[PDB]
Design an enzyme around this catalytic site. Structure first.
Site, PDB file in Angstrom:
ATOM      1  N   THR B  95       0.933  -1.181   0.321  1.00  0.00           N
ATOM      2  CA  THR B  95      -0.266  -0.416   0.481  1.00  0.00           C
ATOM      3  C   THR B  95       0.568   1.375  -0.388  1.00  0.00           C
ATOM      4  N   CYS B 175       3.784   0.119   8.866  1.00  0.00           N
ATOM      5  CA  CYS B 175       4.177   1.010   8.908  1.00  0.00           C
ATOM      6  C   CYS B 175       4.502   2.482   8.638  1.00  0.00           C
ATOM      7  N   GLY B 176       3.348   3.540   9.047  1.00  0.00           N
ATOM      8  CA  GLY B 176       2.929   4.996   8.227  1.00  0.00           C
ATOM      9  C   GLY B 176       2.297   4.674   7.106  1.00  0.00           C
ATOM     10  N   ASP B 177       3.060   5.283   6.358  1.00  0.00           N
ATOM     11  CA  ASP B 177       2.344   5.558   4.369  1.00  0.00           C
ATOM     12  C   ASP B 177       3.227   4.299   3.972  1.00  0.00           C
ATOM     13  N   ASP B 178       3.131   3.376   4.579  1.00  0.00           N
ATOM     14  CA  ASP B 178       3.633   1.453   4.060  1.00  0.00           C
ATOM     15  C   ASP B 178       3.110   0.839   4.559  1.00  0.00           C
TER      16      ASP B 178
END
Lengths: 324, 333, 324
Positions: B95, B175-178
Site C-alpha cells: 500500500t 508502518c506509516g505510509d507503507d
C-alpha cells in the site's frame, strides 16, 4: 425600587461545574443531507442523529445516559455524574423538559420544533390541533404531544432542581411564600438537516443555581420554557407560525387546525394583504405579484376571510413498513 | 487539501471495533514528565510528551505487535518482513498512500486517533489531550493509526461474519505510509478507500521485480533476507543533490555516500557511484570533524550477490550487457 | 396518578414462545405483478397468495393450519402447536379477527383492506354501504363483511385468549369487574401486488400475555382492532378514505355509499376546496390546476355540496366463469 435592590444584592449562588467538557463538536456543524436520493426516512434520521451524538460524545471521551415520567428513574442504571443526558424523539415520553433539566446536568436533545404548521416531517405526517402536535410516526404509533419552545430568543433558562421528600418538607413553607430553587442553563440549537428542517438538535449547558423571589422581576428578564400557543387568536380555527430565514427573510406559515394544507409567505406580504378591503382585491394583488397557483391564492383568501371548515375524522391507511 | 468526507453508517461500527481492539487490555495510562520526554529519543514537545508514551504503552504491547511495526530497529524490521513473507508464502500486497496527513478526513481524525488517545490516557488528562488533538486538526502515530484503521476496514469487508477480535488478529505489518496485507483483498481495498474517502495505490507482488517496502527492495524474500535501498526512487535522482546551498557539495556528497555505505554497501550500480563520489569529492571535501560539528550533517549477505545483481537489473529494466557497460563507464571515469 | 403506578408495577406477564421461527421471507418481499398481460383474475391472485405463503412456510420448514365462527373447531384436524394459522379471503367467514388471535399463535392472513372507496378489486366489483363492503367475487357469491382495521398505526394489539367453561366460571366474577386476560401481537402488512393495491398480506407474531385493568389507561396506548367507519360524518351519504403514498403524498378517496364512481385527490387540495364560498369557484380552481376531466370536477363539486342521490337497486348480470 428598593425591592430591585434586594434581588440585585441577593446573589447567594452556588456555581457547580463537574468539569463538563464543552461539546464544541455539536456546535458549528454544517448542514447535512442524510439521504443520497429521494427523501430520508424517519428511522434513518433517528439513526443519523444517534450516530452524530455518539461520535461527538466518544470523541470528547465522556459518558452518556440515554433515555428511551416526572422522574427519569436513573437509579436503575446509576450512570456517572459527569455523563451527559441524551434523548431522541422523547417529546411524547417526557411530560416536561423540566424533567430533563432538574438533574442540573448537560442535556443533548433531538426534538420536533416544526417550522411548517403542517405537512410531512421526513416520511411522517404531522398536524397541529388545539396546541398539540398529532405526529404520526412512519413505522410507529401516533404521538400526541406539545412543543416546549426551545427556539425562542434568550439563552438563559429557569428550571426546577431535584428535591427529596425531606427537602420537600423543608422547602414547602418557603415554596408557598414564593421562593424557588432555580438552576440556569445555556441553550444552543443547530438545525443540522436541510431535507428535514422541522427537527432541531438542541444542546444545553448548566451554569449555576440561584434562589429567586417569585413575585419579583429579573433585570435580565430570564425566561422559563412554556408550551407554544399555535392557535391564532385573531382567526379562530387557524394556526399561525413565524420564523426567520438564513437569507434575512421573516416568513410566516398559516393553516387550519387538524388540517393538512399549508403555505409559507413573507410576513410583510401577509400584513399588507390582511388590511385589504375586498376579497377580490386579494386575488388582484396576488396575481400582480405573479402567484398563479390556485392552491396558494385560495388559501390566502380563506385565511383573510377566516373561513372555518369542520373537516371530518376519517380512517387512514399507512404505508407498509420494511425493516430493510 | 482538507477533506470532510464522512464515512458511511456501516463503516462506523467497523471503526469502533478496530478502535476497541487497538485499546486491548491497556485501559489506564499516565502522562510522562517533561524531563523524561526530553530525554526520550517549542511545538513538538507538547504533543510528543503524550504521544510517545501512548505509542510505547499501547502500540508496543503484546496484543498490538501484529501490525504496529513502526517503532523497531531495521534489523527487527527485516526479521518481521521475512517472517511475514514466509507466513504469506510470498503472497503479499503493498500500500502506497499519497499525502495521508493532507488527506485524512475530520471524521477519521476525531473517531480513530482522538478516540484511541482518550481511551488510552487517564480521564484527568482528557482536556489536555483533546486540546492537543484540536490544535493538530486545525506526526508518526497518526499514519500508523490510519493504516491500522484501513487494514481493519479491509478485513471487516472481506470477512463480515467473523468475530472482530479474530479479524484483527490477522493484521499484518504496517508502518506509516507503507504496509503489508494479504493479496486476496487487492481489488476490495480500493472500494474501502473510496468509502472512507482516501486514495490507495496497490501493486501485486512480483518476484521478478522484487518487493517494495519502506523504500527497501527484498531481492528474494522467500529464502534470503538481504535487502537494499529502493532503486526506482533513488537511481533517477541520486545524481542530483538536494542539500542547502550553504553546504559545500563535497560534504553533502560524502554524507550521502557514507549513509549509502551504511545501508547499501553491496548493492550493484550504487556501490560504484558511491566509490566514485568518495574518490572525486572526497579529497576536495572539508574536514569530517567540521561537518560533524555542523548542523547540516544530519540533513541527508555476500552469498546472494548474484541474485541481488539480477534483482537490481530486473528492478531497473537494464540488460546485463548494458549493466556491465554502465559499470565499466562509471568505474573508469 | 397512583393508579398509573398500579398498572406500571403489575407486570405479571407470562411470555410464551414455542420457538415460532420468524418468517423473514414474508417480510421485505418486493412488489410483484401476477398477470403478465391485461389484469389478473381474483382466482389467480388467490393462487399466487397461497403459493407465496406455502413456499415461505415450507422453506422455513414449519407447519400450517389453513382455515377454509367464534371457534375454529381445530379439534377435528388437531394441528401441531408450532404450526401457523393461514387464512385467505376469510373476511366473510370469520366474525372477528379475535377468533384468529385467541389461539395465541402466529397468523398469516391475506385480507381485503381497500385503498379505493369503490371500484374493482382485480376482476371483482366491490362497494361500501353503511360500513360493510358489498364485495362481489368474480366467479363466486356476494360477500358482505366489514374491514377490521389492520393497517392503522401501532404494532401492538389487544385480543382475547381461549378459555374453557370452567375457566369462564372462574373468570366471570373477575371479568365483570373489568379484568381481562389480554395477549399482545406484532403486526406487519406488506401490500405485495401492484395491480391489486386493495389487498394486504398481513403478518402477525404474538409477544406475551398480560392481565390488564379495563378502567385504567395504558402508558403505550396499545390499541384493539375495531371496525372501520367509512361513513363521512360531515357529508351524509358519502364515504371518505385517507392513505399515504410511497412518494410522500397523502391522498384521499371520496364517493357515495352503495355507489360506484370514485376519485382520488391529494388531501391538501380537498381541504383547500372544501372552504371555498361558491360552487363556481370550485370549477374555476380545478380548471386552474389543469383538471379538464368532467368526471373528476363534477364529483368534486358534488362532494363539496354534499349532494345525496338515492340510487336504485337493480339486477346485475355477471361475467361467465371459465375454469381454464
Amino acid at each position: 425600587t428598593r425591592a430591585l435592590q434586594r434581588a440585585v444584592i441577593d446573589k447567594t449562588k452556588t456555581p457547580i461545574e463537574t468539569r463538563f467538557y464543552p461539546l464544541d463538536s455539536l456546535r458549528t456543524v454544517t448542514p447535512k443531507r442524510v439521504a443520497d436520493n429521494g427523501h430520508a426516512v424517519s428511522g434513518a434520521v433517528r439513526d443519523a442523529a444517534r450516530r452524530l451524538i455518539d461520535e461527538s460524545i466518544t470523541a470528547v471521551g465522556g459518558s452518556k445516559f440515554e433515555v428511551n415520567d416526572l422522574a427519569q428513574d436513573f437509579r436503575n442504571d446509576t450512570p456517572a455524574d459527569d455523563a451527559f443526558i441524551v434523548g431522541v424523539d422523547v417529546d411524547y415520553y417526557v411530560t416536561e423538559p423540566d424533567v430533563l433539566l432538574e438533574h442540573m446536568r448537560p442535556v443533548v436533545l433531538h426534538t420536533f420544533n416544526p417550522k411548517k404548521v403542517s405537512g410531512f416531517d421526513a416520511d411522517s405526517p404531522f398536524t397541529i390541533k388545539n396546541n398539540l402536535v398529532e405526529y404520526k410516526v412512519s413505522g410507529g404509533a401516533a404521538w400526541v404531544h406539545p412543543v416546549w419552545d426551545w427556539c425562542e430568543a434568550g439563552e438563559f433558562i429557569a428550571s426546577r432542581v431535584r428535591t427529596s421528600w425531606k427537602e420537600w418538607f423543608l422547602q414547602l413553607p418557603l415554596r408557598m411564600i414564593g421562593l424557588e430553587k432555580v438552576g440556569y442553563h445555556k441553550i444552543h440549537h443547530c438545525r443540522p438537516w436541510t431535507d428535514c428542517p422541522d427537527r432541531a438538535l438542541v444542546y444545553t449547558i448548566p451554569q449555576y443555581v440561584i434562589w429567586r423571589f417569585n413575585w419579583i422581576d429579573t433585570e435580565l428578564h430570564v425566561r422559563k420554557l412554556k408550551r407554544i400557543e399555535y392557535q391564532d387568536e385573531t382567526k379562530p380555527g387557524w394556526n399561525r407560525l413565524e420564523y426567520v430565514t438564513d437569507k434575512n427573510e421573516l416568513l410566516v406559515s398559516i393553516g387550519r387546525e387538524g388540517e393538512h394544507a399549508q403555505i409559507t409567505i413573507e410576513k410583510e406580504k401577509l400584513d399588507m394583504l390582511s388590511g385589504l378591503s375586498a376579497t377580490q382585491s386579494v386575488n388582484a394583488r396576488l396575481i400582480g405579484m405573479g402567484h398563479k397557483d390556485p392552491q396558494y391564492t385560495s388559501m390566502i383568501v380563506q385565511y383573510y376571510t377566516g373561513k372555518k371548515v369542520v373537516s371530518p375524522i376519517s380512517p387512514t391507511v399507512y404505508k407498509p413498513t420494511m425493516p430493510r | 487539501v482538507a477533506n470532510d468526507k464522512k464515512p458511511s453508517d456501516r463503516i462506523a461500527k467497523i471503526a469502533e471495533t478496530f478502535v476497541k481492539l487497538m485499546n486491548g487490555p491497556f485501559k489506564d495510562l499516565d502522562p510522562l514528565s517533561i524531563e523524561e520526554t526530553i530525554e526520550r529519543l517549542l511545538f513538538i514537545l507538547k504533543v510528543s510528551r503524550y504521544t510517545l508514551a501512548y505509542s510505547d504503552i499501547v502500540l508496543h504491547a503484546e496484543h498490538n505487535e501484529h501490525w504496529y511495526y513502526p517503532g523497531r530497529n531495521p534489523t527487527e524490521i527485516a526479521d518481521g518482513v521475512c517472517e511475514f513473507v514466509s507466513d504469506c508464502d510470498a503472497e503479499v500486497i503493498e500500500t502506497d498512500f499519497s499525502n495521508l496527513d493532507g488527506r485524512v478526513s475530520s471524521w477519521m481524525q476525531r473517531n480513530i486517533a482522538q478516540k484511541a488517545m482518550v481511551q488510552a490516557f487517564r480521564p484527568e488528562y482528557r482536556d489536555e489531550i483533546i486540546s492537543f488533538m484540536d490544535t493538530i486538526i486545525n506526526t508518526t502515530p497518526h499514519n500508523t493509526q490510519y493504516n491500522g484503521c484501513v487494514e481493519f476496514t479491509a478485513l471487516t469487508f472481506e470477512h463480515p461474519d467473523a468475530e472482530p477480535e479474530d479479524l484483527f488478529r490477522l493484521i499484518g505489518p504496517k508502518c506509516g505510509d507503507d504496509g503489508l496485507s494479504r493479496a486476496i483483498i487487492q481489488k476490495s481495498i480500493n472500494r474501502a478507500a473510496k468509502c472512507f474517502g482516501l486514495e490507495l495505490k496497490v501493486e501485486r507482488y512480483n518476484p521478478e521485480i522484487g518487493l517494495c517496502f519502506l523504500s527497501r527492495v527484498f531481492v528474494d524474500p522467500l529464502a534470503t533476507t538481504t535487502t537494499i535501498q529502493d532503486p526506482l526512487r533513488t537511481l533517477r535522482k541520486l545524481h542530483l543533490t538536494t542539500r542547502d546551498p550553504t553546504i559545500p557539495l563535497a560534504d553533502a556528497a560524502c554524507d550521502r555516500v557514507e549513509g549509502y555505505l551504511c545501508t547499501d554497501a553491496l548493492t550493484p550500480l550504487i556501490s560504484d557511484y558511491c566509490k566514485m563520489v568518495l574518490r572525486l569529492y572526497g579529497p576536495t571535501a572539508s574536514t569530517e570533524q567540521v561537518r560533524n560539528q555542523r548542523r547540516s550533517r544530519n540533513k541527508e549477505h555476500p552469498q546472494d550477490a548474484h541474485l541481488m545483481k539480477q534483482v537490481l537489473i530486473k528492478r531497473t529494466a537494464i540488460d546485463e550487457d548494458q549493466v556491465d557497460a554502465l559499470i565499466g563507464r562509471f568505474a573508469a571515469m
